[PDB]
Each structure stands twice: as structure tokens, then as C-alpha cells.
Paper text:
Encoded by the smallest of the eight viral genome segments, [name] is a multifunctional RNA-binding protein, which is considered the main weapon of the virus to antagonize the innate immune response of the host and to ensure viral replication in a hostile anti-viral environment. While the effector domain is to some extent dispensable for the biological activities of [name], the RBD plays an essential role in several activities that require the interaction of [name] with viral and non-viral [name]. This is best illustrated by the total loss of pathogenicity conferred by the alanine substitution of Arg38 and Lys41, the two main residues involved in binding of [name] by [name].
To get insight into the sequence-specific recognition of the double stranded RNA by the RBD, we solved, at 1.75 Å resolution, the crystal structure of the complex associating the wild type [name]-RBD to the AWFC01 duplex (wtH7N1-RDB/AWFC01). The overall structure of the RBD in the complex is identical to that found in the apo form, with minor side chain rearrangements at the binding interface of helix α2 residues R37, R38, and K41. The [name] RBD sits almost parallel to the [name] helix axis and overlays the minor and the major grooves of the duplex. All direct interactions between the [name] RBD and AWFC01 occur via phosphate/amino acid and sugar/amino acid H-bonds and none through base recognition. Surprisingly, this revealed that in the high affinity [name] (AWFC01), the RNA axis is bent in a non-symmetrical fashion, whereas in the two other complexes (aaH7N1-RBD/AWFC01 and wtH7N1-RBD/ZKO*), the RNA axis bend is distributed symmetrically from the centre of the duplex.
Author numbering:
A (entry chain B): 1 to 71
B (entry chain A): 2 to 71
Amino acid sequence: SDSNTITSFQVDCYLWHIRKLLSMRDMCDAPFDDRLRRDQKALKGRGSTLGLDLRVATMEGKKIVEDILKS
Amino acid sequence: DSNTITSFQVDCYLWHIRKLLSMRDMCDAPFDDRLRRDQKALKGRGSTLGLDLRVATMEGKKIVEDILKS
RNA sequence: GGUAACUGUUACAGUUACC
RNA sequence: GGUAACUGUUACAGUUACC
């Protein structure tokens, strides 16, 4: 598999999770929710294409983001 | 509108995180394509709202850290 | 339209913010 | 109606992953 393809998917999953948290707290505007919906479907399609569980990918993306932010 | 401003500040900080991934050469070409699209989009939204991008990015960082704290 | 995701340019319908 | 961003749809041209 292509490493940067996987990494990009895992990071994208984690940042979708962060955006969803904002929406769940009623702190985002309507276009932000529209993009959340578009990206939600896109990540499901990418996960199916790569054969990856979305929850596992999210946790991996969390660790990647945390590792970069710490440096 | 507070939710409009909050969404912009968060989007600014999340763009910053994505750009750091790109600068480490850890991302794929479509990820970079979206980074360029969103750079243009945020410039337009920042102009429309009258908000400084550096300051909004710092405020987005605080918001993101606060909602994650829970 | 190979599957999936996306980008640039264009149009329409619409959403949100602002006037 | 306008400015900006976006969502859906569409036209043209592309990018990446997939032995």
C-alpha cells in the first residue's frame, strides 16, 4: 500500500472527528455542518477503497496529529 | 454571528494542522489539492468577516483544545 | 463513468454569514 | 439582488490510490 495515502486518510478521519465534536456542541454554522456531511460520506468511501476500519483509522490519525503537534 | 466566527477559527487551526502534515511530506496529492483549495477559501472567508488569519488560528487552537478536553 | 476520493474552470437550485 | 464560503446537481479538463 501507499504510505502517504494511508496517513492522509487517518489524519482526515481524526480531523473529521474534531469537527463533529464542534457540531455536537452546537458551536458551528450551517455550512460547516454541510461540509461535515460531505466529508462523512467521502471517508466511508475511502475507507471501503482502502479496506480500513474508520474507528481504527481515527485513532491512528490522533496519534499522528499528536506526534506532529508535539514537534 | 458567534457560530460563524467559531467555525472560521476552527477551520483556520485545522488547516494549520493539515499544512504541517504536508510540510513533513506525509500526505498524498489530493490532500495537498484540498489544502490549496481551503487556503483560498479561508482567505475569502477571513476577508468577508474582517478577521486576521493568524489571530483566528490561535483562537481556533484554544477552541479545539477546549472541546477535546471534555 | 474501471472503483474510490479529490482539484481547476462553468452553470443551475439551495444553505449560511454580511449589505 | 449583491459579496464570500459552502452543499447538491451538471459540463469540460485533470490529479492521486488501487498488483
